[PDB]
Design a protein around this ligand. Structure first.
Ligand SMILES: N=C(N)c1ccc(C=O)cc1
Ligand SMILES: [Ca+2]
Length: 223
């Protein structure tokens, strides 16, 4: 997250870190057994880390649970990033409390102008590289579909939306991939892609979660 703020420990209780010997992506806990992340975060041997603040220090509220199964969206295209969503099942159910909690799925899509919270452990620099140890947060509005398409000609599908600031300086970035965009207590987006980070006229692009609620619910019901 570039141009954000320190969230505070366990203030984003649905935020998870996906770990394969090291943090490599974010994700969102949607019930005691399931995490939603980006399909471009797929790999084998995932351990899901819940209740994290400093990802390099055991602070007392962590739950580390190995993934038993990953399900990449059936229509994920890794070239275009269309349908950039994946579900990860935990080998054992998480213990839910104030610091480890699921986030609600949307019942309808959000609108341009809605304020959301984007979070992650990704790069905090727009030019260089600096990875934080503690969770970073950014409040950002959803941008109009027209401005999103104008920013990224030929690239924005109906399964994507832009959020952030056209002026630059505030954005998600590398390492935030797969993490949450939460608006009014609903998971509306997943950190997906963008041109660099926090660049003028290049806002963040996010997977449009509301399009996937039916798939998420039916997948969970049978897996
Ligand atoms: N919001 C961005 N600019 C952004 C999001 C994800 C990636 C993935 O590496 C890169 C850039
Ligand atoms: Ca920790």
């Amino acid at each position: 997250i570039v141009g954000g703020y320190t969230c505070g420990a366990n203030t984003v209780p649905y935020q998870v870190s996906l770990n394969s010997g090291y943090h490599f992506c974010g994700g969102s806990l949607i019930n005691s057994q399931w995490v939603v992340s980006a399909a471009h975060c797929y790999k084998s041997g995932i351990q899901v880390r819940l209740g994290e603040d400093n990802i390099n220090v055991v602070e007392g509220n962590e739950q580390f649970i190995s993934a038993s199964k990953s399900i990449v969206h059936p229509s994920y295209n890794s070239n275009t990033l269309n349908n950039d969503i994946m579900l990860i099942k935990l080998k054992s159910a998480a213990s839910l409390n104030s610091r480890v909690a699921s986030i609600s799925l949307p019942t309808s899509c959000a609108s341009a102008g809605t304020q959301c919270l984007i979070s992650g452990w990704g790069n905090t620099k727009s030019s260089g590289t600096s990875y934080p140890d503690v969770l970073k947060c950014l409040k950002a509005p959803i941008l109009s579909d027209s401005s999103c398409k104008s920013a990224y000609p030929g690239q924005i599908t109906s399964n994507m939306f832009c959020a952030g600031y056209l002026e630059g300086g505030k954005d998600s970035c590398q390492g935030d991939s797969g993490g949450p965009v939460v608006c009014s207590g609903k998971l509306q987006g997943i950190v997906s892609w963008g041109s660099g980070c926090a660049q003028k006229n290049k806002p963040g692009v996010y997977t449009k979660v509301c399009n996937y609620v039916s798939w998420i619910k039916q997948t969970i019901a049978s897996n």
